[PDB]
Write a protein that binds this DNA or RNA. Structure first.
Ligand SMILES: Nc1ncnc2c1ncn2[C@@H]1O[C@H](COP(=O)(O)OP(=O)(O)O)[C@@H](O)[C@H]1O
Ligand SMILES: [Mg+2]
Lengths: 580, 98, 93, 107, 87, 93, 107, 95, 86
DNA sequence: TCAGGATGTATATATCTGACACGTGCCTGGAGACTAGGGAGTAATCCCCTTGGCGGTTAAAACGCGGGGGACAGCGCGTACGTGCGTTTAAGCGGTGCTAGAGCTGTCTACGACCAATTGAGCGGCCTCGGCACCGGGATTCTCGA
DNA sequence: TCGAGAATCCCGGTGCCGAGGCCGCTCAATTGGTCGTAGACAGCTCTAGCACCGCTTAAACGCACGTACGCGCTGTCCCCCGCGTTTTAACCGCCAAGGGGATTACTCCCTAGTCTCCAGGCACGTGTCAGATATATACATCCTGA
């Protein structure tokens, strides 16, 4: 019960913000509520949830403290923020100055929205070399500005600019890149001096490692700096199953949600617009193949059982073998791609089973990659199967990123599978037209889910979204799968904290929270080639069953060697035994 | 009608600019890949500290500068201001290496 | 944990030669390695020098011939003068 | 019975005790002398003061209060015999002193 | 196809034309031929081969996998190349 | 009065390599100084090699890295093979 | 209790005891190993047998039973790596192996 | 008579073929005694010492003429001059 | 007992002998100014080596220079000589 | 292409000579037994290096492209040593004497070595501040052509 | 023989970060008190270095042609230089986890001293054998010549 001690801490440190320019009471100490939107706002009307959240952040400005918008992607943080800037610019008459920080990929979006929705507010951009940047540099040195755009790199490059000027109200974006504590940019914003008040903005809350800490639980709030220094482990000890996480520390979680009430604001898209018809979240199970059979473990044997194998060996040779291409000259000295070279991998068997069916049923599938060697080999055999497709990568330079999407979104196009990486695009890709996603290897963080999965489920896709998550039997990337998935479901408390971080019905944080604690108590319960089942997992309805069973009869007469390539033996064992 | 320099003046301006300055010359990362690639031949999966790569870098840089100075003296002895393969291999041949 | 360097000794020499002149970290390290290397030359050569005479002990004469034989030129004369001066001043204490 | 460092008895800076110990444990000889570490202390006094003094002259010529390894470079290679001692050994960050061949430069 | 790493600019060419150009300009040379490049890359590869041989010998002796600065300083200092500022 | 030399050892090597071939006095002295000099290289370098590791004792591994680091070329491989062979044969006695 | 020289235990010629003592009193390290003098004895076996064998081949080529420092000269500088070891060091009475430059000699 | 340059080959082959000491003993003896008289007076040299220093300076100086020969043939001049013979010890690192 | 003074104690190396000495080195055509320069470099080398040798002989407190002192002077000089001991 | 030219090969003999076999004294290697300390092993903590990717920003690097000059064969001419050749001549050698000092053996101390108390000196952390680094902008300064 | 134009250094203004003091800790220096022992003198041996002294003879030298070649001079191009324009990857920052160097601290185990008797090698002598000066011989090889 340290929230009362924190009430004393905010009693002592509360006067820093205002002076230097019921736990709600400290944030309720001033009485005003204004629902009305700004009148000078042009270009449309605010959504009901936009008016509520806007009234919430402005309600924080009433007490003047800092605030957080944690809500889901697609809810329009943009128009809410610039509406706070024009409303705060209009009614409150503090009028500025304002500092906004967004990624460069979204700088066109923010710059385009600041014109329509706020024509009166003067802005500034930074791009196009020091030649074009020096003009607006001379423009800002005179002190003429209101809302100034900039990106992350121009913080350290413009360190002189921001150092020579004192700001008032800053609102940044992409808080989950900024989150890093030891990040040079964060230290430079600690040496930044300050503005009056700051707003962190992130599409997704804390992810991966232990609770908030480095970002919102240190960097955002003035009291939280000196207060939460030691307590990070005291409140992080939850993360020895029922007796800890459930029995005693449930109230500890309740206090973790109790302290974040005035701070975070998060709301689900399904609670407001809910334009997503539905989704399908499933997985599959693959097994090993020639090199991926005991020869795989045999490599682990002679090599161990360079270095850093267990992390490196997976994403290379449990997806596709001879990505080293050194043993490729052993298995395939002809350096020529022929049938059953790409089928020596156990994971690819499932693929080349689906691809004929998706080619027959005519569905466009998204694919996400890591270890771009898989993109090269998968691209070459992808040319062997003779089906159209489109590529992308981190070397794309954004020319094919901007121009390619117009070629993809064409309905008459024959491009089916669409090549992507996990980290590429920065969530600005905007692809609504593909109903299917398959992924070879699971990312270390939920950004696989909240990025690759938000590519489909976003507005513009009215069909059913199917997902296939590949995994192999008797492998360590398993315990990476249940490690990231299950062990990183600790954030389930936060995704539950969005619902009672919303309008927060009384039964949400006890009755319905407990209804989730069902999913908290089935954890261990979920720890425990079939052509018909794998055929039916992609079947939406009955007239698809007609064509897929028609394919079953098509390949029922013809024989379709063996399943995949097998260890004929002289290639397998002699591979890695002469290296060491 | 543009403006240019007579051939050989830019050479003096360069030489003065470099010999005037102490800054490291060859670029770090390519030399990093060179040292890792050439050390991969002897023993696998070595790990180099930053100060080690800077050490070997500055060493080979200084010695190689000395080599081009020697080659310059041998060239100007040959009456040819241009350095060739012959005199640059004659420098390390006369030094006692080759 | 403990890494020993000459350091403040070279600093004191700097302050008794050029008081206003300062020294950087790279210069302190490079001159540290200097005195370490020169010491290794003198002592390392005086070792074998005393070994050729079948003399078990190293003495002031061994270091004498060591520094006289090590560094060529007139530079050795001043080292001999300052050295013998410091030895006589030490024994006269 | 007051403790007095014998490095101060010789009126030196480099320590006599440290060079005496380090010389002992450096297994250079099975027995060590008395005035030998004093003598090494002296020659290190003269060498360090010498080269560091030339470095001070070079830094003064460049109008720089502190000294840079460039200044130690000029200090070394300016003197003849001091370069004769350090000729075989290289250095770090020093660079090369400016030189241009006679007939190489044009008229 | 292009999947193979065999097709790429080799590492020894990582030293560029203006790099070695400048590096000779410090040496005081005016006019440079065209084969100075390849020949000097060969020399550099041989020298680095030797020094890294000695270095990996020391580091291998200590059983460590980390090549340190003191290592290279011992290799150069033993070869007659002794280098100050680090050791 | 007593001046030691390797001598008859080099003589025995000569008789186990080329039995009929003889050796002169100048050749015996020059190869004596040979083995003395090479020994001085190997042991003298192994000393400082064991000193850099702060290891007080010199051992078979120190001489190992000493001879491997001393003489370049394929010539070191046979010295390593014969050396380790002699060490294993010695310990197996 | 019969005394057996450990130099014969390793099947060598150069003595293990002499190199062990001389290595001890040579103040190279404060403690000495066990198999180290055996290992040095071995490498001296191989080096002496190697160079002396090449000398035997040169003397056989010159039709001379005994060996002359000239034969050790040819033995050294004929081999590549053996010359790489002895390149920096000179010799006595050996001389220079015959060599004539290509374009120096006439047609 | 012989054409110029054949006697040179016959000589070079005769010398490089033979191991005998070349420069004459006694003049070198007077040279070493005269040059050592400068440092310390009334030194006494053993015979093996004078033979030592003799053979050493002889071998090194032969190496010097060989390097000067390589520098000369590099210069395209078959004749050796003072320039390249001082360039040999200038490039070696002595001068 | 006595001292016999015979002139030409510097250039006494004869041009036929030093010419042969170059002939061993493989030189083809010898100039006329090679001789004086060679006496210069030989004189300087002799300076250094005998300076070191008499340094050893002086340290040992002996009035007689021995071959071992020369082998040590050449030793640290960078060129080791074999056959005379050490 | 051919004769007679100034230098190197193989063949008996013989002939000093010094390497090698053989045989003694004697100083040092070696096994056995008995005491102490150097490094290898297990094990937490904290800092640095790996190996696959991303997003950006520029200074450098690459590719042409004209075009200026130096490498680069040739051509003559004047020295410049090369190559004998008589003519001195000083180095090699063998052949004594004379003695300075290198070397060996014998004692006798001044001196490092090792060990027990005692404590200022030098090294890490903390904190602070001039000195070097960077930025327009502007006063020469040598170089490109009339 | 002279005048504009890109480079270079002189200028203040910020600006930021290693260099220097300052405080506190801890551990090698410092100061005695035995105590075993190289090495410093001191004297004796002898032996190898230093004098001529004379004889003998290859070795060097001043000097005479006589071609070899090095240097100056001269056309002829081909290669490298200095711009001028794309282009592109080093350079930062960021991410994801993992593993490799360190510093105390019991715990053994392998080689220091250490006294004892025993055999391997070398300085000194016999007493015999490979090689270099000493002789005479077709051939390997080059210059003049055709
Ligand atoms: N009140 C509104 N009226 C009209 N369009 C809106 C409104 N709010 C959001 N949008 C739409 O949302 C888009 C911007 O969404 P964005 O702010 O990028 O989502 P997120 O906040 O999740 O990043 C705009 O293109 C705009 O058309
Ligand atoms: Mg938004």
């Amino acid at each position: 019960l340290l929230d009362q001690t924190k009430d004393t801490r905010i009693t002592h440190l509360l006067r820093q913000t205002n002076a230097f320019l019921d736990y709600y009471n400290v944030a309720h100490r001033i009485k005003e509520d204004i629902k009305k939107q700004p009148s000078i706002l042009v270009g449309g009307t605010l959504k009901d949830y936009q008016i509520k959240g806007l009234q919430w952040m402005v309600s924080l400005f009433n007490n003047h403290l800092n605030g957080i918008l944690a809500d889901e992607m697609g809810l329009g943080k943009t128009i809410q923020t610039i509406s706070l800037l024009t409303y705060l610019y209009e009614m409150k008459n503090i009028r500025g100055p304002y500092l906004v920080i967004v990624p460069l990929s979204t700088l066109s979006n923010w710059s385009s929205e600041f014109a329509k929705w706020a024509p009166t507010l003067r802005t500034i951009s930074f791009k196009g070399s020091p030649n074009e940047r020096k003009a607006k540099q001379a423009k800002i040195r005179a002190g003429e500005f209101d809302v100034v755009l900039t990106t992350f790199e121009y913080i350290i490059k413009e360190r002189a600019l921001l150092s020579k000027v004192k700001w008032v109200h800053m609102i940044i974006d992409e808080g989950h890149r900024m989150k890093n504590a030891q990040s040079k940019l964060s230290l430079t914003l600690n040496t930044h001096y300050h503005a009056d008040y700051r707003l962190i903005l992130t599409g997704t809350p804390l992810q991966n490692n232990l609770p908030e800490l480095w970002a919102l639980l240190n960097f955002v709030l003035p009291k939280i700096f000196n207060s939460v220094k030691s307590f990070d482990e005291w409140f992080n000890t939850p993360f020895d199953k029922i007796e800890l996480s459930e029995e005693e520390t449930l109230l500890v979680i309740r206090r973790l949600h109790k302290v974040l009430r005035p701070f975070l604001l998060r709301r689900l898209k399904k609670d407001v617009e809910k334009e997503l018809p539905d989704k399908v979240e499933k997985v599959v199970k693959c097994k090993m193949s020639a090199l991926q059979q005991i020869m795989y473990q045999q490599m682990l044997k002679y090599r161990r059982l360079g270095f850093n194998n267990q992390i490196m060996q997976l994403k290379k040779i449990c997806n596709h073998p001879f990505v080293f291409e050194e043993v490729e000259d052993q298995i395939n000295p002809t350096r020529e791609t022929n049938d059953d070279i790409w089928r020596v991998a156990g994971k690819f068997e499932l693929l080349d089973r689906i691809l004929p069916k998706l080619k027959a049923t005519g569905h466009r599938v998204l694919i996400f990659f890591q270890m771009t060697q898989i993109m090269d080999i998968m691209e070459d055999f992808l040319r062997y199967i003779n089906i159209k497709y489109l590529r992308l990568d981190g070397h794309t330079k954004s020319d094919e990123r901007s121009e390619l999407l117009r070629l993809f979104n064409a309905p008459d196009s024959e491009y089916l599978c669409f090549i992507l990486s996990t980290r590429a695009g920065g969530l600005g890709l905007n692809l609504q037209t593909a109903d299917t996603v398959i992924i070879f290897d699971t990312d270390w963080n939920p950004h696989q889910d909240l990025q690759a999965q938000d590519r489909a489920h976003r507005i513009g896709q009215k069909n059913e979204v199917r997902i296939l998550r590949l995994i192999t039997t008797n492998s360590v990337e398993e315990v990476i799968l249940e490690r990231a998935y299950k062990k990183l479901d600790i954030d389930g408390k936060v995704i539950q904290a969005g619902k009672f971080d919303n309008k927060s019905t009384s039964e949400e944080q006890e009755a319905l929270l407990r209804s989730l604690l069902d999913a908290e108590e089935e954890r261990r319960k979920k720890r425990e080639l079939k052509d018909s089942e794998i055929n039916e997992i992609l079947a939406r309805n009955d007239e698809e069953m007609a064509v897929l069973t028609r394919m079953d009869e098509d390949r029922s007469k013809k024989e379709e060697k063996s399943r995949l390539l097998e260890k004929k033996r002289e290639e397998s064992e002699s591979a890695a035994v002469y290296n060491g | 009608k543009p403006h240019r320099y007579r051939p050989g003046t830019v050479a003096l301006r360069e030489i003065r600019r470099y010999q005037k300055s102490t800054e490291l010359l060859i670029r770090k990362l390519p030399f990093q890949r060179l040292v890792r690639e050439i050390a991969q031949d002897f023993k696998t999966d070595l790990r180099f500290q930053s100060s080690a790569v800077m050490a070997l870098q500055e060493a080979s840089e200084a010695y190689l500068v000395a080599l081009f100075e020697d080659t310059n003296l041998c060239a100007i002895h040959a009456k040819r201001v241009t350095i060739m393969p012959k005199d640059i291999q004659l420098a390390r041949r006369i030094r006692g290496e080759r | 944990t403990r890494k020993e360097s000459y350091a403040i000794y070279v600093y004191k020499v700097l302050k008794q030669v050029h008081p206003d002149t300062g020294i950087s970290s790279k210069a302190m390290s490079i001159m540290n390695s200097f005195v370490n290397d020169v010491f290794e030359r003198i002592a390392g050569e005086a070792s074998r020098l005393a070994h050729y005479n079948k003399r078990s002990t190293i003495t002031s004469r061994e270091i004498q011939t060591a520094v006289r034989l090590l560094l060529p030129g007139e530079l050795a004369k001043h080292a001999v003068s300052e050295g013998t001066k410091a030895v006589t001043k030490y024994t006269s204490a | 019975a007051k403790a007095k460092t014998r490095s101060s008895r010789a009126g030196l800076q480099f320590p006599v005790g440290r060079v005496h110990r380090l010389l002992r444990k450096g297994n250079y000889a099975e027995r060590v002398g008395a005035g030998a570490p004093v003598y090494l202390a002296a020659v290190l006094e003269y060498l360090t003061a010498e080269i560091l003094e030339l470095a001070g002259n070079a830094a003064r010529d460049n109008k720089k209060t502190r000294i840079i390894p460039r200044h130690l470079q000029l200090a070394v290679r300016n003197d003849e015999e001091l370069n004769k001692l350090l000729g075989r050994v290289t250095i770090a960050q020093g660079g090369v002193l400016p030189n241009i061949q006679s007939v190489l430069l044009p008229k | 196809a292009k999947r193979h790493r065999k097709v790429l600019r080799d590492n020894i060419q990582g030293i560029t034309k203006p790099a070695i150009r400048r590096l000779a300009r410090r040496g005081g040379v005016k006019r440079i031929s065209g084969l100075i490049y390849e020949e000097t890359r060969g020399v550099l590869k041989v020298f680095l081969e030797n020094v890294i041989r000695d270095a990996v010998t020391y580091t291998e002796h200590a059983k460590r996998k980390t090549v340190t600065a003191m290592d290279v300083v011992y290799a150069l200092k033993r070869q007659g190349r002794t280098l100050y500022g680090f050791g």
